[PDB]
Amino acid sequence: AVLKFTTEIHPSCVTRQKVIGAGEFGEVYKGMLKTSEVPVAIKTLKAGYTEKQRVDFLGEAGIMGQFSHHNIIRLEGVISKYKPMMIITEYMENGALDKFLREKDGEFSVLQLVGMLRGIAAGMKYLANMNYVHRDLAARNILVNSNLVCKVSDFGLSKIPIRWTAPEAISYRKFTSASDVWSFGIVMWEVMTYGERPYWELSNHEVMKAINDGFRLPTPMDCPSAIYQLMMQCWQQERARRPKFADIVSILDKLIRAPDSLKTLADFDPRVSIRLP
Numbered sequence: 001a002v003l004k005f006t007t008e009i010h011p012s013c014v015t016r017q018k019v020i021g022a023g024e025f026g027e028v029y030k031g032m033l034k035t036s037e038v039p040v041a042i043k044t045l046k047a048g049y050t051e052k053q054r055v056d057f058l059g060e061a062g063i064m065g066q067f068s069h070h071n072i073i074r075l076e077g078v079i080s081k082y083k084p085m086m087i088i089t090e091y092m093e094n095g096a097l098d099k100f101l102r103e104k105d106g107e108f109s110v111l112q113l114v115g116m117l118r119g120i121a122a123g124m125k126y127l128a129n130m131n132y133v134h135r136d137l138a139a140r141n142i143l144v145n146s147n148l149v150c151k152v153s154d155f156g157l158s159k160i161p162i163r164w165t166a167p168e169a170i171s172y173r174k175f176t177s178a179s180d181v182w183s184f185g186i187v188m189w190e191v192m193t194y195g196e197r198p199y200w201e202l203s204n205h206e207v208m209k210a211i212n213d214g215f216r217l218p219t220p221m222d223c224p225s226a227i228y229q230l231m232m233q234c235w236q237q238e239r240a241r242r243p244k245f246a247d248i249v250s251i252l253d254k255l256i257r258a259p260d261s262l263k264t265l266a267d268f269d270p271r272v273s274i275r276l277p
């Protein structure tokens, strides 16, 4: 009953080409899939996996089959009847959003950046409504297609993402859609800075200390006032005071549909001073 919304793929339809990462008990590959070839990513469960690993692997496939949304990575199908077992998803030539933005610094309009955030928020609203808590929302877990559409994914830990994680999730392991909202605020900051490292060189302990003392990330350069205000509200210490994803999607949609609203920029706090006549 775990694989209700998933298609079973026969192994003869799949060609693993090059290793692109590490799974939990198997490699992740780039490959080709032939139905109706399309490029795919392929996570495998290799010989020797434990019962817990099998349960988690097939459960992941099952949950992924349930999702059908423009801003969630699409499951092509699963190989469960043969070994090794596989989870097969679409593949994005542009890759993960964090590396993408870092390699394309300054190349997009404010409206393009905000549109990426609206899509991420819409995907997160869907997950939260489906009662799925992501727990690792970060630009590193978002794929970008050739139309600039962002697809929320989960590639596993890179490393504990302290600086993306809400205080209550760090302090007492309370992961909810409201802690995902905190993470989404960090993702907003990553996007508007073209992939800067949150909190720069602060250590994990220094970040938590700063947050507990009330400090928050400063505005990115060239950032719409409305966008900075929204990310700041995602970082409220009190979980219940944060916007829900429905609120975030609504605001971002309204800002995009009235784009003059994005012309008012938050003041950027200069780190250096250059004196010239």
Ligand SMILES: Cc1ccc(C(=O)Nc2cccc(C(F)(F)F)c2)cc1Nc1nc(-c2cccnc2)nc(-c2cccnc2)n1
Binding pocket: 020, 021, 022, 023, 028, 041, 042, 043, 060, 063, 064, 067, 072, 073, 087, 088, 089, 090, 091, 092, 093, 094, 095, 096, 127, 132, 134, 143, 152, 153, 154, 155, 156
């Ligand atoms: C194969 C696979 C299996 C599962 C997932 C995945 O996102 N699972 C997942 C689990 C829980 C929740 C969600 C959710 F959708 F976010 F909600 C997704 C994604 C993929 N696809 C994938 N695409 C890609 C990829 C890379 C470059 C371009 N296009 C796709 N990479 C990787 C990858 C890289 C490094 C380590 N582990 C997995 N994975």
